Amino acid sequence: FSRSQVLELERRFLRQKYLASAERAALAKALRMTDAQVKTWFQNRRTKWRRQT
Ligand code: NA
């Protein structure tokens, strides 16, 4: 993803570690991503979070 896309995903993750289905769809539209891309990103980000804390 672009630098900006990643930063915006990180901004949301800091606030909410899990999103609802509707929230992922809204964020996908806002960040120019597919719903599945947002879902996968957050799964992988949670794995990083678990590893690092
Ligand atoms: Na999620």
Swiss-Prot record:
Residues 1-53 bind DNA. This is T-cell leukemia homeobox protein 2. It comes from Homo sapiens (Human). It is found in: Nucleus. Transcription activator that binds DNA elements with the consensus sequence 5'-CGGTAATTGG-3'. Binds DNA via its homeobox. Required for normal cell death of enteric neurons in the gastrointestinal tract. Required for normal development of the enteric nervous system, and for proper development of normal motility of the gastrointestinal tract. It comes from the Eukaryota.
